[PDB]
Amino acid sequence: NALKSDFDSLRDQIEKAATNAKFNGVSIADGSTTKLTFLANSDGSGFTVNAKTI
Amino acid sequence: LNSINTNAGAMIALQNLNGTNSELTTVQQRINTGKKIASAKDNGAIWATAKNQ
């Protein structure tokens, strides 16, 4: 039971650390979106970064 | 024209000198603050974003 409680505490800490990783209201690792695209050139071309949920 | 009453070249030199003065004022504000967006007047989007963050 003690090892199970340690396991559950570690799992809840992973869930908090995953949820909190945001900047400017968006996140690339929380799974809220599939990808983020940033400007890559003056014509409007983007630099896609695929989200990798953790 | 060889007028005594007006001289456009002095006007054009004043415009160029005022533009250099304004760019010096920008560089001076950015050196005394240490940031290129130090206020909403510089650029409001990144300014408000960094402020809330």
Best A20, A24, A26 member to test B by mutation, with max B CBs in 10 Å, is A24
List A residues 1-54 in contact with B (Cβ-Cβ < 8 A): 23-24
Any idea which residue has 């896609």 for tokens? A48
Angle at B23 between CA B19 and CA B24, to 5 degrees: 115
Which experimental approach was used here? cryo-EM
Placement of tokens 């992973």 in the chain? A14
Q: Which residues of A touch B53 (CB under 8 A)?
A: 23-24
- The whole-angstrom separation of Cα A20 and Cα A13 is 11
Closest Cα to residue A23, out of B24, B49, B47, B26? B49
B49/A23 touch (CB, cutoff 8 Å), yes or no? no
Q: What value does the CA radius of gyration of chain A take, rounded to a whole number of Å?
A: 17
Nearest to A37 by CA among A24, A29, A49, A53: A49
Chain B environment of A27 (Cβ under 8 Å): none
Up-side HSE of residue A13: CA atoms within 13 Å toward CB? 6
> Kind and range of the H or E element at A36?
strand A35-39
Distance, CA of B30 to CA of A7 (rounded, Å):
51
Query: CA torsion sign, A29 to A31 to A32 to A36?
Result: positive
Residue type, B38: A
By the CB < 8 Å criterion, does B49 face chain A?
yes
The DSSP 8-state label assigned to residue A35 in this structure reads E
